[PDB]
Design an enzyme around this catalytic site. Structure first.
Site, mmCIF file in Angstrom:
data_model
loop_
_atom_site.group_PDB
_atom_site.id
_atom_site.type_symbol
_atom_site.label_atom_id
_atom_site.label_comp_id
_atom_site.label_asym_id
_atom_site.label_seq_id
_atom_site.Cartn_x
_atom_site.Cartn_y
_atom_site.Cartn_z
ATOM 1 N N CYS A 174 -34.833 10.003 -1.014
ATOM 2 C CA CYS A 174 -33.876 10.097 -2.112
ATOM 3 C C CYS A 174 -34.454 9.562 -3.404
ATOM 4 O O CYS A 174 -35.561 8.997 -3.444
ATOM 5 C CB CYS A 174 -32.557 9.357 -1.770
ATOM 6 S SG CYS A 174 -32.624 7.555 -1.858
ATOM 7 N N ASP A 185 -35.195 5.739 -3.608
ATOM 8 C CA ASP A 185 -36.423 5.422 -2.849
ATOM 9 C C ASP A 185 -37.688 5.541 -3.695
ATOM 10 O O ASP A 185 -38.564 4.671 -3.641
ATOM 11 C CB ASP A 185 -36.556 6.350 -1.658
ATOM 12 C CG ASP A 185 -35.796 5.886 -0.509
ATOM 13 O OD1 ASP A 185 -35.926 4.684 -0.323
ATOM 14 O OD2 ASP A 185 -35.150 6.672 0.213
ATOM 15 N N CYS A 238 -28.717 8.397 1.323
ATOM 16 C CA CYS A 238 -29.842 9.096 0.701
ATOM 17 C C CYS A 238 -29.502 10.526 0.292
ATOM 18 O O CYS A 238 -29.938 10.999 -0.778
ATOM 19 C CB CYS A 238 -31.056 9.139 1.637
ATOM 20 S SG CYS A 238 -31.706 7.524 2.057
#
Length: 208
Positions: free
Chosen positions: A96, A99, A159
């Site tokens: 995602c 991240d 995510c």
């Protein structure tokens, strides 16, 4: 805005019983090499019994494995996603948008990140280092956030709803059609990078 609720639930997710808190940074640094990572290899790097590695990975049901049973993905992954994470001309991927903002500080590398706007398909890119973001193209890039849910796997609960957008107004238009998502919020990519910095500070604190 006020991002404490997001920071709190992200930390709670990793600090959970059998959560990933202490295994996460060593695993990301190993995946960053671009090759699959053996469980047995990971146990040795952590100095844990195999039992302990397994219970953690067992709880992390999103963990990706290859045909040999080696780890190829946990946040950072060798399997293609919408979030390209390029380090030293190795093309890796992320689960995602947030991240991609978090990992450079944890692995001590600068990444060339690219994706597409979730609302319009426009290409987006930026350079993310441990301390800062640069070359934000386009400059008004935005990120969606939702609240992680108690005890839920982070990939399907968080995510998959955490995207890049070409701009904040574009992202807010999109968000107006998805108000069923818990704690849905639009922030600039800078605000999101700040959230990642807070998560990392707390993570690196707690790490034994």
């Amino acid at each position: 805005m006020k991002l404490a609720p997001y920071i709190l639930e992200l930390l709670t997710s990793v600090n959970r019983t059998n959560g990933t808190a202490d295994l996460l940074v060593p695993l990301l640094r190993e995946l960053a090499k671009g090759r699959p990572v053996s469980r047995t290899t990971l146990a040795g790097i952590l100095d844990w019994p195999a039992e302990r590695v397994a219970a953690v990975l067992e709880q992390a049901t999103s963990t990706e494995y290859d045909k040999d049973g080696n780890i190829i993905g946990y946040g950072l992954t060798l399997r293609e996603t919408s979030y390209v994470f390029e380090i030293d001309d190795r093309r890796l991927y992320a689960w995602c948008a947030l991240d991609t903002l978090i990992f450079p500080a944890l692995i001590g590398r600068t990444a060339r990140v690219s994706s597409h706007c979730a609302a319009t398909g426009a290409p987006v890119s930026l350079t993310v280092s441990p301390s800062e973001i640069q070359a934000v193209e386009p400059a008004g890039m935005a990120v969606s956030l939702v609240l992680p849910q108690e005890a839920a796997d982070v990939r399907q609960s968080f995510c998959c709803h955490v995207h890049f957008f070409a701009s904040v107004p574009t992202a807010e238009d999109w968000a107006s059609k998805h108000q069923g998502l818990e704690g849905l919020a639009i922030v600039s990519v800078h605000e999101a990078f700040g959230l990642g910095q807070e998560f990392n500070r707390h993570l690196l604190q707690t790490m034994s």
